[PDB]
Design a protein around this nucleic acid. Structure first.
Ligand SMILES: Nc1ncnc2c1ncn2[C@@H]1O[C@H](COP(=O)(O)OP(=O)(O)OP(O)(O)=S)[C@@H](O)[C@H]1O
Ligand SMILES: Nc1ncnc2c1ncn2[C@@H]1O[C@H](COP(=O)(O)OP(=O)(O)OP(O)(O)=S)[C@@H](O)[C@H]1O
Ligand SMILES: [Mg+2]
Ligand SMILES: [Mg+2]
Lengths: 320, 257, 396, 254, 258
DNA sequence: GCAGACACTACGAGTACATA
DNA sequence: TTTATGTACTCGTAGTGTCTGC
């Protein structure tokens, strides 16, 4: 069995708060907390892959360089995050006597706290209210709606935002300077367009393209990763001249092996997030796509159901 | 070669002492001074005050450099204390400003050594200055007999109405299912004095106690053959178990009258 | 050791006049807790104008961060009582509550002996925080707490968030009903002026209203917000107030009345409203309370004066159009809650039951939002059914 | 007007331990000749009847028959309180809404008196159907308990078939099958452990595993259990006592 | 005549072997040949392997004409084994192309022969032979002592680090609630040779193991009074429990270190 | 040696959520 | 009093097995 090279996702994982590129105000605030020391309870939320847990880990490393292995607790959904284990472990950690530097506090990191049970969060509320001058919590969830209201009340909400293409380009050029590779600007633009703000997706696509071909060119990138289905579905829905939408479907979704359920769900999401057309036409289109979704889920999954959904959408578009 | 080298000569004694009040309280502060080890704990319901004191004579070699607070969880201490043998000699060790303590379980055979580190929990508990007062009655009976009687009565009601009148202890209990009563007579046993009942009468008493609290108190009945209970009308009961060089006295507050 | 504690604990109310806002609730609570002795000797039968005599226990409810816990603790400490605080971190099921503070309800403290003039130092006050955290329901401790309210020999204080839970029903009138509200802007303004003086950071007297209204009166998050802002930039003015507001909006989950009230507004369905309040926002608004929203739309989808009528379309035609989609979404709800359990149709049910029917009858309202009446009539219908099968069994 | 003073509370303790789970509510229709009781389970398929004569009691005096509707959990707690060397004294009044269980020890160190109220449980219909049983066997209770437990591990329906002096407890399930046969062994040095059978006519009866496991809890009463079967009448598992006996009536379930 | 006829003296034996790895393994198979009834199975998590061999010496009378494979569910088999007494004698009976075996519980003290049948199963796991023969450290210590050490160190943490030095065996179990360090040195007890501990150190060994699987290993300490651990880097640990005719050797994969 | 006393895994029953 | 399977969690429960000491 051959050995495996470390993936570029964590082979170039940042270790300093200056390495991560993104929301400049957020990173400056994190650096200020790093220099000062008095870290408040924070709830970091945002889209996947935009550098949430890496910032928390870098901040904890900078704050507890010498006592990271002793005064930092890391829990996630992979651990038994239930009321008994949360109670016992968090209360044992929050009362443990560890002589940190005067500005440094214990940090309890809870990755992906969105999937955490309500009673465990209720216990965490009381634990945070008791032990706050010795330990400081730190959540990192994709959506902050799952976390109960009192936990957000006693924390400091800090939301991330999707990275602009400039920051993804800067990081990609930094990694390309770190490891030698031949690239074309068209290939990098294609990778950035495919990533859609997801830095981890960009790194995975770049690594896959380099391993598959060795040259980061537009054709190689489009061979490794296909065009995203939301874009082709949006092109299908927005286009008039029903025959054109029918052939777009039959060419780019049916013969490319996309399941009918996936096409219908993607159409629902696209027409929900669509902004070019007015509200009433979006509502009708959602109604028709939902009727087709009901038909598909009942079991009648064929090309003709999708064609009929497109036909009803186009009859709506031409205003009968 | 550290601050504290308190060395028990027989570890199961310390295991019994810790298990004596394991369930009632979890966090306990251990004050370690030159005279001995004194510990005070407060129950979560603030009704039980488990005062403890171990003299220097109990330890085979007790050497405390200067007074210090040792706050440790009883759950972790009981988990660690299940790692030794009857011949094992506990050699509790603490360093300067301790964050962890080494419970070195030595053995008579020198090829078997087991050291366990225990992380100290920061506990904020105000010290209670108890005072010596005369109680209306002092009852001393064997711990096994007392435990038997109280476990008999606790299977009937959640409350016990201890009564001492006319040199007649009147352990009674009334509940929804029924009513129970036990009457004992103080006497002296020539064959085995530790099986006798001794009582002194100063004032009558009217005291009431719960069930689970008394069960937690008698959980530590293994340390002493006989328990010394002192009753006062307007003062907490003092359930005292005499050790070889110390005691484990419980302060349980009687209910409303 | 100072300058490491949170700003929400070092700047905490020490005495009763430092609790900014809700003075009436605090003074009522203190009056109730100060006259429980004579009421106890009155066998909870005779009460004054306020009724504190007949209320054996008092419970506290309201939005977070307004001072329920702090005011309760200060009142308990001031009058010489010994605090006994409980929480959801300690399990409070039937067994652990019957073997918990059940003994301490009719028993007096032991720490009060050695801490002593104080006339109530040998008593307990039961401060049960996080009682909404106990989601046990049946045999989950709520019935045990009802029994405790029925029979306790010590003051009993409960702290929760809001009362509209069906779990919270058994405390309808057995417990006192003191309630806290959002504190006024003047008291918070004075408190934050003192905070700004203490922490030498610039705080304009006019940005504070926006800081309060973004956080919805949650004082603790306000103090945390000023702390985290002043970490890197201690001066705030009109320049950064919009960025601070958009970055630290509270984003509360809306109340079942509030989802319907926001959804029936005609402003959000206009061309400007659609851009500011997108369709995804309406879907999230439905999913805030996806259980009660489809009904709550339906009971009052026709009691609104329309403002989004198409030219030539009457109000009754719009009501019929909304009713057709309510009927259509009924089928989707049935298919979701069936043997197959196709739960991927919930976003469909959003549009088919709340978005589209409210998109035709939007505008200003004839009256206040009417609660879902389908629940009560469903209960009465079920009782009528049970009676009919009962008399059918009897008649044969 | 009832004074039933036992010589050892362990007898009553193992009796109630015998019928903890088969029934929860029982009406004690005590008489002069002793105490008899009849009880039916919730499923209306298991019938338990107990009988203890005066010969077991050190003292007994019951002038007026009184039907006592009494809980078994409370008795279990009160008799777990009791132990050896203590003589239980069952005492009742003329109109005993509450019962008295005096625990008298040899020494005067600790004598305990207890109480328990009497709930309202309707008098069960005393069916006295004693139809003759085709086959009769008696084997040690430990052997029968082991056999029924091991065969109930495999399946939930134990077949009992008697033919040619060879009882064949067969239980067939999903993990496999189980067949045990018993020859009519006779023992001289230890007559208590023996297998004797009276096969008048072969029978083939199937019983559920839950009730067959439940009836085992009376094994502490007798070292031997006598079983008599009929093709249509309910089976009779009888536990010998010093004075009387305790019996289980379970109808066949084909 | 049944082609497979294996007789057990002191039928509590086979129950002890079955209980040795009932908990860790749920599905096994028994390649019964003329040499003896061997077995080999891998857990669902593919971490721990259980090899087994029972020689002809352990059987009163053993006769196996052709190689037989008996894929089995260990839960049902252990239940069947529990359906008997240690006084009885157990017999495995299988015919040609078996669908199930026949287990007999006979005793001459009292004729109460009980015949149980357990359904077979098609595991279809060909596995492979053991290809590990060289080990750095070869140590043997009493089973009771090792089981006790594992038991009191599994409560502290989930990882038990076994370190081997020059005549020094160290177990480190650092965890959340504290740490642990059991140091045991070789010694030869002349009075009780069964309680002696032996060490044979070639190259230093530093391996960590999971607590739950090590508890599953020590669950077999009732099978034999002594266990011989044979550690080596880049090689699974070999915990071998000797039998009267064969052995019950386990293979445990050390956890990764990074 | 036997009976308890413990901690232990295991089974049963009930609440809660189910798309971003 | 509603949805109506499957999943996950939480609890108290009853057996089950192991260690102490009469
Ligand atoms: N601002 C950034 N600067 C540099 N690398 C980044 C940045 N954001 C993300 N990355 C890269 O993304 C990877 C780390 O992503 P994560 O932070 O683990 O994703 P995440 O934010 O945790 O989102 P989820 O919810 O866990 S999927 C590493 O390969 C990083 O190099
Ligand atoms: N009236 C007030 N004036 C100023 N600060 C206040 C006030 N009420 C609360 N606070 C702040 O909030 C902190 C704690 O408030 P709490 O009363 O514990 O919150 P809460 O009402 O219990 O809400 P929960 O428990 O999180 S749902 C105090 O230490 C203060 O910093
Ligand atoms: Mg993450
Ligand atoms: Mg509160």
């Amino acid at each position: 069995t051959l050995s495996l090279q470390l993936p570029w996702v964590e082979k170039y994982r940042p270790q300093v708060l200056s390495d991560i590129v993104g929301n400049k105000e957020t990173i400056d605030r994190l650096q200020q907390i790093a220099k000062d020391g008095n870290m408040p309870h924070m709830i970091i939320s945002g889209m996947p892959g935009i550098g949430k847990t890496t910032s928390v880990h870098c901040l904890a490393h900078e704050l507890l360089g010498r006592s990271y292995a002793d005064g930092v607790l890391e829990l996630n959904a992979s651990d038994d995050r239930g009321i008994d284990v949360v109670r016992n472990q968090i209360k044992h950690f929050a009362q443990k006597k560890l002589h940190l530097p005067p500005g440094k506090h214990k940090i309890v990191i809870l990755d992906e706290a969105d999937s955490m049970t309500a009673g465990a969060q209720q216990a965490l509320r009381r634990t945070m209210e008791l032990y706050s001058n010795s330990t400081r919590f730190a959540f990192a969830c994709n959506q902050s709606n799952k976390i109960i209201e009192p936990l957000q009340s006693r924390c400091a909400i800090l939301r991330y935002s999707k990275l602009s293409d400039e920051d993804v380009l800067k990081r990609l050029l930094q990694i390309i300077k770190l490891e030698d590779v031949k690239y074309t600007n068209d290939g990098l633009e294609a990778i950035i367009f495919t990533a859609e703000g997801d830095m981890r997706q960009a790194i995975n696509n770049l690594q896959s393209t380099v391993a598959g071909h060795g040259l980061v060119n537009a054709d190689n990138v489009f061979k490794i990763v296909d065009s995203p289905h939301p874009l082709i579905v949006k092109k299908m829905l927005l286009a008039s001249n029903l025959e054109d939408s029918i052939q777009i479907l039959r060419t780019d979704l049916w013969k490319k092996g996309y399941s009918s359920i996936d096409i219908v769900t993607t159409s629902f999401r696209v027409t929900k997030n669509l902004a070019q057309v007015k509200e009433s036409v979006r509502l009708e289109m959602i109604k028709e796509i939902g009727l087709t979704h009901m038909r598909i889920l009942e079991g009648v999954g064929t090309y003709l159901q999708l064609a009929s959904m497109l036909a009803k959408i186009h009859k709506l578009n031409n205003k009968a | 070669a550290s601050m504290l080298e308190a060395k028990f000569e027989e570890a199961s004694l310390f295991k019994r002492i810790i298990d004596g009040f394991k369930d009632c309280v979890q966090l306990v502060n251990f004050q370690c001074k030159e005279d001995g080890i004194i510990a005070q704990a407060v129950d979560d319901s603030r009704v039980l005050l488990v005062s403890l004191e171990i003299g220097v004579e109990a330890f085979q070699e007790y050497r405390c450099d200067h007074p210090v607070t040792l706050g440790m969880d009883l759950t972790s201490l009981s988990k660690i204390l299940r790692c030794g043998n009857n011949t094992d000699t506990l050699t509790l060790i603490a360093d300067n400003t301790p964050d962890s303590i080494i419970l070195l379980f030595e053995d008579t055979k020198k090829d078997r050594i087991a050291e366990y580190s225990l992380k100290l929990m920061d506990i904020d508990a105000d010290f209670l200055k108890i005072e010596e007062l005369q109680y209306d009655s002092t009852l001393s009976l064997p711990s096994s007999e007392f435990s038997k009687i109280v476990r008999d009565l606790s299977q009937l009601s959640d409350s016990i109405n201890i009564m001492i009148t006319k040199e007649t202890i009147k352990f009674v209990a009334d509940g929804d299912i029924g009513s129970g009563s036990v009457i004992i007579k103080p006497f002296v046993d020539m064959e085995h004095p530790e099986t006798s009942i001794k009582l002194e009468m100063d004032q009558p008493v009217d005291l009431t106690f719960g069930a689970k609290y008394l069960l937690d108190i008698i959980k530590g009945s293994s340390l002493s053959d006989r328990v010394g209970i002192r009753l006062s009308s307007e003062a907490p009961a003092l359930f005292q178990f005499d050790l070889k060089s110390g005691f484990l006295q419980f302060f349980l507050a009687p209910k409303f009258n | 050791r100072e300058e490491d504690k949170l700003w929400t604990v070092k700047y905490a109310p020490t005495n009763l006049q430092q609790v900014c806002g809700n003075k009436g609730s605090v003074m009522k609570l203190k009056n109730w807790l100060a006259n429980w002795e004579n009421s106890k000797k009155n066998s909870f039968k005779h009460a004054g104008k306020d009724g504190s005599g007949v209320f054996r226990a008092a419970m506290l409810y309201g939005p977070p961060g307004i001072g329920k816990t702090t005011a309760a603790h200060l009142v308990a400490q001031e009058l010489g009582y010994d605090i006994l605080e409980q929480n959801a971190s300690d399990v409070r099921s039937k067994t652990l509550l019957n073997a918990g503070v059940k003994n301490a309800l009719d028993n007096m403290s032991v720490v009060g002996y050695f801490k002593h003039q104080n006339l109530n130092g040998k008593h307990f006050v039961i401060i049960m925080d996080e009682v909404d955290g106990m989601s046990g329901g049946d045999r989950g401790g709520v019935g045990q707490l009802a029994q405790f309210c029925r029979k306790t020999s010590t003051p009993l204080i409960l702290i929760c968030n809001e009362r509209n839970l069906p779990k919270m029903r058994p405390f309808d009138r057995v417990c006192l009903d003191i309630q806290f509200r959002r504190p006024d802007a003047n008291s918070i303004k004075s408190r934050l002026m003192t905070i700004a003086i203490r922490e030498k950071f610039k705080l304009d007297p006019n940005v504070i209203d926006r800081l309060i209204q973004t956080t919805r009166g949650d004082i603790r998050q306000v103090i945390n917000l000023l702390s985290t802002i002043s970490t890197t930039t201690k001066t705030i003015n009109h320049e950064n107030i919009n960025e601070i507001s958009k970055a630290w909006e509270k984003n509360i989950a809306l109340k079942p009345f509030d989802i319907a009230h926001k959804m029936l507004d005609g402003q959000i369905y206009s061309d400007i409203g659609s851009r500011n309040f997108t369709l995804n926002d309406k879907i999230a608004l439905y999913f805030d309370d996806f259980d009660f929203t489809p009904l709550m739309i339906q009971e009052n989808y026709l009691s609104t004066r329309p403002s989004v009528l198409k030219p030539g379309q009457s109000h009754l035609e719009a009501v019929a159009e909304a009713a057709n989609c309510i009927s259509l979404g009924d089928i989707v709800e049935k298919k979701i809650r069936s043997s197959e359990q196709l739960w991927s149709l919930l976003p469909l049910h959003a549009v088919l039951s709340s978005v589209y029917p409210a998109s035709k009858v939007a505008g200003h309202m004839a009256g206040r939002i009417n609660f879902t009446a389908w629940l009560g009539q469903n209960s009465k219908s079920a009782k009528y059914y049970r009676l009919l099968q009962e008399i059918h069994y009897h008649t044969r």
